Design a protein around this ligand. Sequence first.
Ligand SMILES: OC[C@H]1O[C@@H](O[C@H]2[C@H](O)[C@@H](O)[C@H](O[C@H]3[C@H](O)[C@@H](O)[C@H](O[C@H]4[C@H](O)[C@@H](O)[C@H](O[C@H]5[C@H](O)[C@@H](O)[C@H](O[C@H]6[C@H](O)[C@@H](O)[C@H](O)O[C@@H]6CO)O[C@@H]5CO)O[C@@H]4CO)O[C@@H]3CO)O[C@@H]2CO)[C@H](O)[C@@H](O)[C@@H]1O
Ligand SMILES: [Cu+2]
Length: 224
Amino acid sequence: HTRMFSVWVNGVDQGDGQNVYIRTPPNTDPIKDLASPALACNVKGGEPVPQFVSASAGDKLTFEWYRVKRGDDIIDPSHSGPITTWIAAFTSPTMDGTGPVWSKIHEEGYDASTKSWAVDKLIANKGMWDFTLPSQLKPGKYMLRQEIVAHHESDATFDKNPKRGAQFYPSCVQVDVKGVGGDAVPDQAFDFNKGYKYSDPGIAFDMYTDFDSYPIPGPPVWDA
Ligand SMILES: OC[C@H]1O[C@@H](O[C@H]2[C@H](O)[C@@H](O)[C@H](O[C@H]3[C@H](O)[C@@H](O)[C@H](O[C@H]4[C@H](O)[C@@H](O)[C@H](O[C@H]5[C@H](O)[C@@H](O)[C@H](O[C@H]6[C@H](O)[C@@H](O)[C@H](O)O[C@@H]6CO)O[C@@H]5CO)O[C@@H]4CO)O[C@@H]3CO)O[C@@H]2CO)[C@H](O)[C@@H](O)[C@@H]1O
Ligand SMILES: [Cu+2]
């Protein structure tokens, strides 16, 4: 259990984002049903918030996460798994992030050298998660989506044991991308309800064995 507090732009906190520029769900509960409309932007994903983060293409962004209170333990260390970041054009305000619209822009999963997960790193860096807005990206509004997947109970699938299964923690942020950017339009058009399946070995994943690597679900990072 976890959710986002604010976004930082080149190391500058834009201030509490919850129901401002983040589509903040009412609590920290996980999505587990891969058929749920909420898989994409969580439980209030379809409700506009009034603001957009201001950034230029190429800018470094930091997503800041918390569990109960800002600056706390962030998420339970049991909750090992990867952290992926996505982009989609802002089609209309009542978009909810369903359909074939997403391109993946960053991922960290399992680092075998350190035996460290993305989540272990999120914790040790106090809920701060960094990535870059592609410098080639075309100026305009987009939704960013960033997702912690936790695998403490991914050793079964939800469809077989509803009391278990992988847990998805998606956060969608509204961003007005300015500066020069380039001509890149995100064009992987990945659909989460279609594209995440119980058969994916990055979902049906047993973290309680001697494993050497973790296959992160979805396409590779957008070639930009
Ligand atoms: O399978 C074989 C292997 O098993 C391993 O053991 C595993 C085991 O399999 C697995 O089932 C187990 O799972 C437990 C997790 O480890 C543990 O983290 C999890 O704790 C949850 C807890 O269930 C939940 O209630 C709690 O909810 C909080 C939430 O954190 C918090 O954000 C929210 O806060 C709200 C405030 O209260 C409110 O004031 C404010 O306004 O809103 C906030 C939210 O917006 O409150 C809720 C409820 O109070 O979250 C915690 C986690 O943070 O429990 C799981 C059990 O169901 O893990 C085991 C390992 O750890 C063996 O280890 C291995 O040997 C075997 O091979
Ligand atoms: Cu949890």
